[PDB]
Design a binder for these strands. Structure first.
Ligand SMILES: [Mg+2]
Ligand SMILES: [Mg+2]
Ligand SMILES: [Mg+2]
Ligand SMILES: [Mg+2]
Ligand SMILES: [Mg+2]
Ligand SMILES: [Mg+2]
Ligand SMILES: [Mg+2]
Ligand SMILES: [Mg+2]
Ligand SMILES: [Mg+2]
Ligand SMILES: [Mg+2]
Ligand SMILES: [Mg+2]
Ligand SMILES: [Mg+2]
Ligand SMILES: [Mg+2]
Ligand SMILES: [Mg+2]
Ligand SMILES: [Mg+2]
Ligand SMILES: [Mg+2]
Ligand SMILES: [Mg+2]
Ligand SMILES: [Mg+2]
Ligand SMILES: [Mg+2]
Ligand SMILES: [Mg+2]
Ligand SMILES: [Mg+2]
Ligand SMILES: [Mg+2]
Ligand SMILES: [Mg+2]
Ligand SMILES: [Zn+2]
Lengths: 155, 99, 60, 116, 208, 126
RNA sequence: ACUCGUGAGAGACUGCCGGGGUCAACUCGGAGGAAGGUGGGGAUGACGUCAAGUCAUCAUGCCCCUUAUGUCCAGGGCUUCACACAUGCUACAAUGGCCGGUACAAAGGGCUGCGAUGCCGUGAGGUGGAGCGAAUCCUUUCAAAGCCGGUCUCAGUUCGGAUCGGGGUCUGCAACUCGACCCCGUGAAGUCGGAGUCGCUAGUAAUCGCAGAUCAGCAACGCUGCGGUGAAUACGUUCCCG
């Protein structure tokens, strides 16, 4: 990484619908690299989410991404023998990756008796503002405006 | 129609091709029809033994066995042709299977 | 490799179960390869000297 | 339900209900189920007494289960630990037979781990 | 360890095999008879340095090639040593064997011969300094050879410690696989113990 | 007669194109039964739609070497090169798509001292 | 007429252009091209250090036994075990276990060895034995994850398999210590884990199989290689190690 900016892979778009956000989502939800089962789980969860919400799946996913996408993040630094938290803005691509990846790693952890339904129901909870994603958004913002005053370092 | 399989099957590229050229020339001035040295899967043996005794096994070396095999499918097995065939003297590199 | 042990292994034993390899050059009971009949150290030194017909560095 | 003094599950398949009996495992459960001809996917709610009785008769006729198995195994252990063989000594001192790594494994035979 | 055998490294491209035959059925016996006869030759023949030993075998016939600096003692004018070697070969039952004797064109340009000479000089009385001076100067006298290194390790002069000393002169590209490297080594005898001699010979390069 | 071969990590395929219908035959069966994964189905229907020559070429394919994704990518490349061979005028478009250039990655050398590929065993300084 | 395999040759050399450049190296971008600026990975360890490891691979100076510390089997132990550390395997369960149906690999071994078809066994295996010194015959048409259908509704569980006992096979003169494999019952323990710590930047990580090999069996989850499904990110050196 020292030598310069590494080239970025040209990720392919989802052909079933037309949004590459699904491709990134299946890449994140990959468990030991079994894409066939992973993507069929993703599509089944999206179908049951459609059945639950009665609206457009792509519109719901875009709404969830808009609701849980960040703008500021907190980084750690040690100066003079003491560690401090400094906030720095993030690029929208990084923001989307964090939003979807927090969505999935929180959908991993409910007790709804089955995680194929947990995926869709966390999607719904992020959409309506009652999810683990949105509560982490509240916590991260609380930490952000708690430590905005350290922005003078600008690192 | 009788087919006899002339096998030029050994290790090394240079000597095996020398033998193949000699066999092709023998067929040429003997008057027979032969396809020639058709490519065949060469056997590749890999053996791993540790380069140092008494531990120090993280660094090693590999060895290779390239077993080169040629097929010479002769047509019209003339008795004089086959006589010249086993009267040819070949170097120790190549082994012939007259089948 | 004690020479008495090597020679005792060389003689035909009372039962076929008592036969192992005992590399000819050095009598090493362990770390042997059959198709050559040589142990690791002997195989390596012979290969480096070029006296065994064929074994060579491989890379792929 | 109830069978040979064993409380059958409230709602479970017979292939597991029969394994809950001491003397029957998965393979013999499948074998006995195939022999009797009853479906293996039927729920507990649909059991009827006559099949239970005939299965009980079959299993008591052809196999030994539960308390009798307790007595044969414990009597064998006491006998062959009285005769004093190597397995007898292993049972006496509470260590496994098969000569596995008692170095660090066999903590199943050792029970809980106590630090010295 | 520091370096692998250059002969093994460049064995696939610039150098050629000394023993060439094919075996799958009884190859263990072929190689064990080969090593046995080579050991007996090395033990019996010490007065004349055997530079190279080469054998090629078909079916039963085997032809052994012996390269030596001078053949006068290797084969007698009447053939006593040849008869002794044939007797040893038939005692190990090497069936029909034919021997060839070839004398080298430049004894000072071959790794084994100079190594044996330096080993003999070191063994009898000659100091490593003068021995290596003479060896290096005799080496660079020949125009064809360019780069020379010689190394010795062990107890030098009878001291109770190990000296590892080497001399370099010219160009010897170890890392260059194109380089024509001639490798040789020998174990010299001494009253205080044994000392190893290691030599590398660079002689031109080949293109193709 | 136009021929092509796909090259994806030791997987080799051979497909024959016919100017007939858009029917796919993979070792005697269609794509819908052979390898029922929508990602595969779409990546196989992609070249014809992106060249906008849909439902105009029959393919008869033979499969060998590698595994599932290897064969999918191999026939992927096979039709990718066959379309250019029969119609080179879309070569700039496909290479701008990045689609004529094969991806030459495969299982790398397995190294001594390593569990597999490039991974190292557990390391402790104590 | 293609892969199939193995020969010869060609193809990456900043080849060309714009700009910075001391008009010099060099760099960014752009067209062609399969690759663009050592395309990817290996073999390839400069002088030297740790008096680093190896007199049980081998060879060897000195000292020591020589009627013993030599030889041979009158069997056994190298695997014993109140406990710790180190590296792995299998998991801790539903992206799952089990059952039925079902499609794709590479490379490699085989003479006192691989072993077909057939019959008997739950299955180790037993009878019998074609084809092979081997692109042919056996390693099954080399598969597993992969797709479809059915169960389990989260339980110390249909997860999870040890422990012990009861019954056989296989190598062998002879399986008690001290083998492996096959069949049954056996149902304990444990719910992602303490500071600290490891490896990984493209077929990589992660996961699922096969094979070289020593061998007569076998502690074979190992070493080595051969494969299968296949990601994420790099804002930049202020901090830690080299
Ligand atoms: Mg043996
Ligand atoms: Mg050995
Ligand atoms: Mg390959
Ligand atoms: Mg691999
Ligand atoms: Mg290791
Ligand atoms: Mg150096
Ligand atoms: Mg030392
Ligand atoms: Mg000693
Ligand atoms: Mg010595
Ligand atoms: Mg000694
Ligand atoms: Mg012992
Ligand atoms: Mg022992
Ligand atoms: Mg360690
Ligand atoms: Mg399991
Ligand atoms: Mg199945
Ligand atoms: Mg099949
Ligand atoms: Mg049967
Ligand atoms: Mg279990
Ligand atoms: Mg637990
Ligand atoms: Mg739980
Ligand atoms: Mg922690
Ligand atoms: Mg596994
Ligand atoms: Mg073995
Ligand atoms: Zn040896």
């Amino acid at each position: 990484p020292r030598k310069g900016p590494a080239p970025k892979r040209p990720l392919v778009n989802d052909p079933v619908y037309g949004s590459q956000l699904v491709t990134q989502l299946v890449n994140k939800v990959l468990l030991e690299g079994k894409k066939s089962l992973a993507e069929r789980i993703v599509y089944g969860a999206l179908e049951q989410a459609r059945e639950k919400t009665g609206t457009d799946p792509v519109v719901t996913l875009k709404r969830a991404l808009d609701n849980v996408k960040p703008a500021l993040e907190v980084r750690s630094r040690r100066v003079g023998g003491a560690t401090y938290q400094v906030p720095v803005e993030v690029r929208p691509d990084r923001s989307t990756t964090l939003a979807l990846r927090w969505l999935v790693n929180f959908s991993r952890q409910r007790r709804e008796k089955t995680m194929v339904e947990r995926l869709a129901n966390e999607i719904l909870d992020a959409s309506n503002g009652l999810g683990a994603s949105v509560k982490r958004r509240e916590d991260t913002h609380k930490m952000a405006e708690a430590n905005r005053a350290f922005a003078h370092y600008r690192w | 129609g009788q087919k006899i399989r002339i096998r030029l099957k050994a290790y090394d590229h240079e000597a095996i091709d020398a033998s193949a050229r000699k066999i092709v020339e023998t067929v040429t001035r003997t008057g027979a029809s032969v396809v020639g040295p058709v490519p065949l899967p060469t056997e590749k043996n890999v053996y791993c033994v540790i380069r140092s005794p008494h531990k120090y096994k993280d660094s090693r070396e590999h060895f290779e066995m390239r077993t080169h095999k040629r097929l010479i499918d002769i047509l019209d097995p003339t008795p004089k042709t086959v006589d010249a065939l086993m009267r040819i003297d070949l170097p120790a590199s190549v082994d012939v299977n007259i089948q | 490799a004690k020479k008495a042990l090597v020679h005792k292994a060389n003689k035909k034993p009372k039962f076929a179960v008592r036969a192992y390899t005992r590399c000819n050059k050095c009598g090493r009971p362990h770390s042997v390869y059959r198709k050559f009949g040589l142990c690791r150290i002997c195989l390596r030194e012979m290969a480096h000297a070029g006296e065994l017909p064929g074994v060579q560095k491989s890379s792929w | 339900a109830r069978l040979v003094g064993v409380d059958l599950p409230r709602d479970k398949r017979m292939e597991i209900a029969l394994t809950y009996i001491y003397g029957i495992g998965r393979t013999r459960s499948n074998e006995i189920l195939a022999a009797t001809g009853i479906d293996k996917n039927m729920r507990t709610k649909d059991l009827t007494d006559d099949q239970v009785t005939v299965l009980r008769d079959y299993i008591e006729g052809n196999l030994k289960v539960e308390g009798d198995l307790r007595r044969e195994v414990q009597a064998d252990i006491r006998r062959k630990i009285e005769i004093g063989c190597y397995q007898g000594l292993r049972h006496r001192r509470g260590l496994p037979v098969r000569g596995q790594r008692t170095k660090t494994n066999a903590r199943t035979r050792k029970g809980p781990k106590r630090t010295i | 360890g520091q370096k692998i055998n250059p002969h093994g490294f460049r064995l696939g491209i610039t150098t050629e095999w000394k023993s060439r035959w094919y075996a799958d059925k009884q190859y263990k016996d072929y190689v064990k008879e080969d090593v046995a006869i080579r050991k007996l030759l090395a033990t019996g023949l010490e007065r004349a340095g055997i530079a190279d030993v080469e054998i090629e075998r078909t079916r039963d016939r085997v032809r052994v090639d012996i390269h030596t600096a001078r053949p006068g003692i290797v084969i007698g004018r009447r053939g006593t040593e040849a008869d002794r070697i044939r007797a040893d070969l038939e005692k190990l039952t090497g069936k029909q064997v034919q021997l060839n004797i070839l004398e080298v064109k430049n004894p000072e340009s071959q790794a084994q011969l100079v190594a044996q000479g330096v080993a003999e000089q070191l063994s009898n009385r000659v100091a490593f300094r003068r021995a290596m001076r003479k060896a290096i100067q005799s080496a660079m006298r020949q125009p064809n050879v360019k780069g020379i290194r010689v190394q010795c390790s062990g107890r030098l002069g009878g001291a109770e410690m190990s000296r590892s000393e080497f001399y370099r002169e010219g160009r010897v590209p170890l890392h260059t696989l194109r380089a024509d490297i001639d490798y040789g080594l020998y174990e010299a005898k001494t009253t205080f113990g044994r000392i190893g001699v290691k030599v590398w010979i660079y002689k031109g390069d080949i293109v193709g | 007669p136009i021929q092509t071969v796909g090259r994806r990590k030791e997987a080799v395929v051979r497909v024959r194109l016919v100017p007939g219908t858009g029917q796919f035959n993979l070792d005697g069966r269609t794509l819908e039964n052979y390898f029922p994964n929508k990602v595969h189905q779409q990546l196989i229907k992609a070249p014809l739609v992106t060249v906008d020559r849909v439902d105009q070429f029959d393919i008869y394919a033979h499969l060998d070497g590698g595994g599932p994704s290897g064969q999918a990518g191999a026939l992927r490349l096979a039709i990718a090169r066959a379309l250019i061979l029969v119609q080179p005028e879309d070569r700039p478009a496909l290479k701008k798509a990045g689609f004529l250039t094969r991806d030459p990655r495969a299982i790398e050398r397995k190294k001594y001292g390593l569990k597999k590929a490039r991974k190292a065993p557990q390391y402790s300084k104590r």
